[PDB]
Amino acid sequence: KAYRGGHLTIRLALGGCTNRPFYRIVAAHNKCPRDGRFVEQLGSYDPLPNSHGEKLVALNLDRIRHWIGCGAHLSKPMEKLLGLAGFFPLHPMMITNAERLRRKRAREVLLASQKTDAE
Amino acid sequence: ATLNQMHRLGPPKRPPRKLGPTEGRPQLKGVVLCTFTRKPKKPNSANRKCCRVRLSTGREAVCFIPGEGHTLQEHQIVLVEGGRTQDLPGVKLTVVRGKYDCGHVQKK
Amino acid sequence: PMKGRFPIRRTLQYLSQGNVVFKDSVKVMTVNYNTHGELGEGARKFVFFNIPQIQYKNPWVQIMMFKNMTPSPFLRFYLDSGEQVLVDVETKSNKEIMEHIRKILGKNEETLREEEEEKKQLSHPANFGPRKYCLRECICEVEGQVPCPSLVPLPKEMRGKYKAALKA
Amino acid sequence: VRSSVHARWIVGKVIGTKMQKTAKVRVTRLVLDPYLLKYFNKRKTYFAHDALQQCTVGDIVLLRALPVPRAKHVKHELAEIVFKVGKVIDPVTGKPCAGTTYLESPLSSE
Amino acid sequence: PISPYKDEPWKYLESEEYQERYGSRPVWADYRRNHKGGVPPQRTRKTCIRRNKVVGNPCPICRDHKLHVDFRNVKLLEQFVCAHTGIIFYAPYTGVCVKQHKRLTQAIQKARDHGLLIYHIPQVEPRDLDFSTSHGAVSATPPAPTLVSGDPWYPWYNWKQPPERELSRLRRLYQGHLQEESGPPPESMPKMP
RNA sequence: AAUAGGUUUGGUCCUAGCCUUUCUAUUAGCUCUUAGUAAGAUUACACAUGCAAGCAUCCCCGUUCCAGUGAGUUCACCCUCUAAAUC
RNA sequence: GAUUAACCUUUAGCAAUAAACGAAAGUUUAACUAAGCUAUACUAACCCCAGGGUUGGUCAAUUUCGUGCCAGCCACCGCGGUCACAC
Ligand code: FES
Ligand SMILES: [K+]
Ligand SMILES: [K+]
Ligand SMILES: [K+]
Ligand SMILES: [K+]
Ligand SMILES: [K+]
Ligand SMILES: [K+]
Ligand SMILES: [Mg+2]
Ligand SMILES: [Mg+2]
Ligand SMILES: [Mg+2]
Ligand SMILES: [Mg+2]
Ligand SMILES: [Mg+2]
Ligand SMILES: [Mg+2]
Ligand SMILES: [Mg+2]
Ligand SMILES: [Mg+2]
Ligand SMILES: [Mg+2]
Ligand SMILES: [Zn+2]
Structure with a gap:
C-alpha cells in the first residue's frame, strides 16, 4: 500500500493482552497501523518488572544504526529508551521531568516539616 | 490411466454439493398454510400429522409435525429444521416443537 | 503401486538428491542424445535419471532435449555472457556426466554453505511474532516474566478495573 | 548488458516465418x-x-533479449541458428550429418 | 474414605493388597472406556469425582482411593510413562480422566526435577566457540574524563541559571501568560522522612 | 477416506452407493455458579441523535492516515526503469 | 428501523502506545487504552448448588405399566397387528 509521502520510523508496537502490555521495537512506515505491517523488528521492550525486578529491553543495535542511516525517524518513547541505554544522550524531557519531580518532592518535604513543626 | 493422461486431466473435481430443502441453512421461518395427515409407504401404517408452510424464502413445502398432538393453525408462525421423515416420501422438513407458535408436547 | 518404471524418480526425496547447482551464468542447457547405440547409453540414463534432479535444483534454467539429430550425444550450455560450453558425453556413464558438469559449471560446497547461512539471518531468535515467523509470540512465554492474564490472573493492583476504582 | 526483458537467453524451434523480418x-x-x-x-x-x-x-x-522491446510482441532477436533444418553440423566433430549418420567422415580431414 | 498411605504412598504398591488386585500389570491394564462407535472421543472425561460423588466407571486412578499421585511414588508414575521412549502416555491411552492426567504429568515432571525418576539427558555442545573474556563488553572500559572528575556526561545535563536579560525577553514575549519563575532544582532527589 | 463399522440376497462371494464412529463452527430446544482472558449484525438494505481532526504568532502542514466493509475482482509477487517522499 | 435461523453499551480517558501539528512546554484523536454486555471459546475454581441426551443392533446403558400397524419412533437397518428391553 503505497502511501502519499511518509517515511520510515522506529517506534513501539503494542502487543500482549489486557493489563499485560508488551512492546515490539519495529521500523515501519509512519502511516501504517501501530500493530500492523512493519519493515523489520529491531528489538522488544517488556515494561512489567520480571521476577528479578528488571525491565528487559532488547536492542538490535547493528540494525538500528542501519535504519537511522537510511533516513528513519525515532518516536519520542524510543528516543528515551536509547537515552536510558546510553546509546543516545538523555532526552531533554527526561532531564526536565526529573527536575520537576525534584521540585515537587522538595515542596512536599517542606509541607511535611511545617506540619510536624506545628504539631 | 497413464501419467500423461492424469497430467492432462488434472486433479478430480468434486460434484458441487447440492443444497437440501433448507438451502444450506440450519432453520427457516415459515407460515402455516394448512394441516393434514399423510400415509406412510409400506410396510408402515399411520396417519402422520403434517402441514404445508410458506417458507421465508417464498417456497412452499410440506413439513412433518413430531410428537403426540399439536395445535397448529393456518396463519401461525413456525420454525422448520432439516431431517427427512423416513417413511413419508417427499417430506424433508420438520417443525421445531417449542418455538414461535408451536409449543412443546404436553406431557402424557 | 506407483505407475511406471523406477517410480523412485517421482519422489521429493530423490529429486533433492541432485548435487548440481549451476552458477548464475548458466541460462540454457541443451541435451542431444540418441535413442539407440551402446556408446550413447550413459547419455540416455542421464536423461532418464538425472535431468529431473538438475531441473529441480535449477528451476529457472531452460532444459531442452533433442533426439537423434547428430551421430553422437553431447551437452551444450549457454551462459549469460554469450559463451557456449560444449560437453562430449559419448562413452561416459550418467554418473561421470553429473560429476563433469558439476566441476565446470556447478557451485562448490563452500559457496552453497555460505548461502544457507545468509538465510538463517532472516529468522532472528530474539524476535517475537506468529509461529510461522518466530519461535515465541509474546514475552509472557519466557519464564520469569509476567505470564499472560489468560492463564494466570494478574493481581488486582495491576488491573485497570481496580486502579480506576480506587482512584475514582 | 541490462534489459527490461525477462527471458534473456532461450532456445526454441522456428514454427512460423510469415511476418516480415520476424x-x-x-x-x-x-x-x-x-x-x-x-x-x-x-x-x-x-x-x-x-x-x-x-x-x-x-x-x-538461439534468441537474445533486446534492451527494450522493438514491438508489442517482439522482445528478442535471432542470435544464432543452432541446428539448421536438414543441414546439421555435428558440433563435436564439425562434420555435416544426416540424423545419426555422417555425410562426411571425420577421418576425411584426420 | 481415608487412605492410610497418604503420608507414605509408595508403601501401597509394596503391600499384599496391591499385589492381589493388580499383580505385575499396570493399574490401568483392565480398564475400558464406555463409548459409542469404534473410534473413541479424543478426550477422556474431565473428572471422575464430581462434588465428592464418583461416576459409574471411574478411571484407573479414581477407582482406587489408595493410589496417590505424588512425585515420590515413582513406581506408580513409571506405569504412565513409556519404558522404551520415555514419553508420557496421553490420557485416552490409559483412560485416566483429564483431572488425574494433569496431576500425573505434574508429578512426573516434579519427580524428574528432583532426580527421583530417570529420564534421558542428552549430551549437548558448548554455547560459544571461543571462551576468551578479553573483549571490552565483559572487561573494563577506560573511564571517560567526566566520569573521573564527577561531572555530568554533557554539560547541558545540569541546570544553568539563565541571564536576567533573557528572562526579561521571555516575560515580554509571554506577558499575561506567565508562571512563577523557577530557580535551580535540588542537587539531589529529596525523600519523605 | 481410518485399525474401521452397519446396510443389497433364501444364501455365498465380488463390486458399489448411502450411513455410523472423530474434530470444528453457526443456529435452535432444554438447562446454567464464580473469576480471568479471547472473540462477538444475517443483510454494499434504510438511518433519528451525539461524537469520531486538528495544530499553530496569521503562512502553511494535517484532515489522502487511522478506523470500516467484502460489493466488485488475476492492479497484490519478481525483474527493469524511474518520479514523489525520508536522510 | 426493516430484514434474517443469526440480535454487545446511544461507557470513560487521552495516563500508556500510535498518529497530526508545534522550535518547544504541549494540544487534539470513538485509533487506542481501561471498563459494560453475551456459555461462542480457552484457563482456573467452588461448603451449599446438574443438567442435557441416550439405554433393539451398529454403540456405553431399562424395570413396571399403558397403548395394540393406533398413538408414535430411527442417522442406517428397523419398531408398533395384546409377553413392545425400539412408542
Ligand atoms: S499472549 Fe502474552 S500477555 Fe497474553
Ligand atoms: K411396520
Ligand atoms: K459398504
Ligand atoms: K500547522
Ligand atoms: K482498513
Ligand atoms: K468481496
Ligand atoms: K494519549
Ligand atoms: Mg430407514
Ligand atoms: Mg434379508
Ligand atoms: Mg456477501
Ligand atoms: Mg527524487
Ligand atoms: Mg451470534
Ligand atoms: Mg471522548
Ligand atoms: Mg473489552
Ligand atoms: Mg405391553
Ligand atoms: Mg422407550
Ligand atoms: Zn479419574
Whole structure:
C-alpha cells in the first residue's frame, strides 16, 4: 500500500493482552497501523518488572544504526529508551521531568516539616 | 490411466454439493398454510400429522409435525429444521416443537 | 503401486538428491542424445535419471532435449555472457556426466554453505511474532516474566478495573 | 548488458516465418507437475527479430533479449541458428550429418 | 474414605493388597472406556469425582482411593510413562480422566526435577566457540574524563541559571501568560522522612 | 477416506452407493455458579441523535492516515526503469 | 428501523502506545487504552448448588405399566397387528 509521502520510523508496537502490555521495537512506515505491517523488528521492550525486578529491553543495535542511516525517524518513547541505554544522550524531557519531580518532592518535604513543626 | 493422461486431466473435481430443502441453512421461518395427515409407504401404517408452510424464502413445502398432538393453525408462525421423515416420501422438513407458535408436547 | 518404471524418480526425496547447482551464468542447457547405440547409453540414463534432479535444483534454467539429430550425444550450455560450453558425453556413464558438469559449471560446497547461512539471518531468535515467523509470540512465554492474564490472573493492583476504582 | 526483458537467453524451434523480418519461435521448458512429481514440457511462443530473414520453419535457434522491446510482441532477436533444418553440423566433430549418420567422415580431414 | 498411605504412598504398591488386585500389570491394564462407535472421543472425561460423588466407571486412578499421585511414588508414575521412549502416555491411552492426567504429568515432571525418576539427558555442545573474556563488553572500559572528575556526561545535563536579560525577553514575549519563575532544582532527589 | 463399522440376497462371494464412529463452527430446544482472558449484525438494505481532526504568532502542514466493509475482482509477487517522499 | 435461523453499551480517558501539528512546554484523536454486555471459546475454581441426551443392533446403558400397524419412533437397518428391553 503505497502511501502519499511518509517515511520510515522506529517506534513501539503494542502487543500482549489486557493489563499485560508488551512492546515490539519495529521500523515501519509512519502511516501504517501501530500493530500492523512493519519493515523489520529491531528489538522488544517488556515494561512489567520480571521476577528479578528488571525491565528487559532488547536492542538490535547493528540494525538500528542501519535504519537511522537510511533516513528513519525515532518516536519520542524510543528516543528515551536509547537515552536510558546510553546509546543516545538523555532526552531533554527526561532531564526536565526529573527536575520537576525534584521540585515537587522538595515542596512536599517542606509541607511535611511545617506540619510536624506545628504539631 | 497413464501419467500423461492424469497430467492432462488434472486433479478430480468434486460434484458441487447440492443444497437440501433448507438451502444450506440450519432453520427457516415459515407460515402455516394448512394441516393434514399423510400415509406412510409400506410396510408402515399411520396417519402422520403434517402441514404445508410458506417458507421465508417464498417456497412452499410440506413439513412433518413430531410428537403426540399439536395445535397448529393456518396463519401461525413456525420454525422448520432439516431431517427427512423416513417413511413419508417427499417430506424433508420438520417443525421445531417449542418455538414461535408451536409449543412443546404436553406431557402424557 | 506407483505407475511406471523406477517410480523412485517421482519422489521429493530423490529429486533433492541432485548435487548440481549451476552458477548464475548458466541460462540454457541443451541435451542431444540418441535413442539407440551402446556408446550413447550413459547419455540416455542421464536423461532418464538425472535431468529431473538438475531441473529441480535449477528451476529457472531452460532444459531442452533433442533426439537423434547428430551421430553422437553431447551437452551444450549457454551462459549469460554469450559463451557456449560444449560437453562430449559419448562413452561416459550418467554418473561421470553429473560429476563433469558439476566441476565446470556447478557451485562448490563452500559457496552453497555460505548461502544457507545468509538465510538463517532472516529468522532472528530474539524476535517475537506468529509461529510461522518466530519461535515465541509474546514475552509472557519466557519464564520469569509476567505470564499472560489468560492463564494466570494478574493481581488486582495491576488491573485497570481496580486502579480506576480506587482512584475514582 | 541490462534489459527490461525477462527471458534473456532461450532456445526454441522456428514454427512460423510469415511476418516480415520476424520469426515465430516455440520455446519449451520443463515444469514439475506437483501431484505426479513428473516433469512435462510447457511451451511458449516468442517473436524474434530476424533482419536477414534467414530462419526456416523447423530449425533450432538461439534468441537474445533486446534492451527494450522493438514491438508489442517482439522482445528478442535471432542470435544464432543452432541446428539448421536438414543441414546439421555435428558440433563435436564439425562434420555435416544426416540424423545419426555422417555425410562426411571425420577421418576425411584426420 | 481415608487412605492410610497418604503420608507414605509408595508403601501401597509394596503391600499384599496391591499385589492381589493388580499383580505385575499396570493399574490401568483392565480398564475400558464406555463409548459409542469404534473410534473413541479424543478426550477422556474431565473428572471422575464430581462434588465428592464418583461416576459409574471411574478411571484407573479414581477407582482406587489408595493410589496417590505424588512425585515420590515413582513406581506408580513409571506405569504412565513409556519404558522404551520415555514419553508420557496421553490420557485416552490409559483412560485416566483429564483431572488425574494433569496431576500425573505434574508429578512426573516434579519427580524428574528432583532426580527421583530417570529420564534421558542428552549430551549437548558448548554455547560459544571461543571462551576468551578479553573483549571490552565483559572487561573494563577506560573511564571517560567526566566520569573521573564527577561531572555530568554533557554539560547541558545540569541546570544553568539563565541571564536576567533573557528572562526579561521571555516575560515580554509571554506577558499575561506567565508562571512563577523557577530557580535551580535540588542537587539531589529529596525523600519523605 | 481410518485399525474401521452397519446396510443389497433364501444364501455365498465380488463390486458399489448411502450411513455410523472423530474434530470444528453457526443456529435452535432444554438447562446454567464464580473469576480471568479471547472473540462477538444475517443483510454494499434504510438511518433519528451525539461524537469520531486538528495544530499553530496569521503562512502553511494535517484532515489522502487511522478506523470500516467484502460489493466488485488475476492492479497484490519478481525483474527493469524511474518520479514523489525520508536522510 | 426493516430484514434474517443469526440480535454487545446511544461507557470513560487521552495516563500508556500510535498518529497530526508545534522550535518547544504541549494540544487534539470513538485509533487506542481501561471498563459494560453475551456459555461462542480457552484457563482456573467452588461448603451449599446438574443438567442435557441416550439405554433393539451398529454403540456405553431399562424395570413396571399403558397403548395394540393406533398413538408414535430411527442417522442406517428397523419398531408398533395384546409377553413392545425400539412408542
Ligand atoms: S499472549 Fe502474552 S500477555 Fe497474553
Ligand atoms: K411396520
Ligand atoms: K459398504
Ligand atoms: K500547522
Ligand atoms: K482498513
Ligand atoms: K468481496
Ligand atoms: K494519549
Ligand atoms: Mg430407514
Ligand atoms: Mg434379508
Ligand atoms: Mg456477501
Ligand atoms: Mg527524487
Ligand atoms: Mg451470534
Ligand atoms: Mg471522548
Ligand atoms: Mg473489552
Ligand atoms: Mg405391553
Ligand atoms: Mg422407550
Ligand atoms: Zn479419574
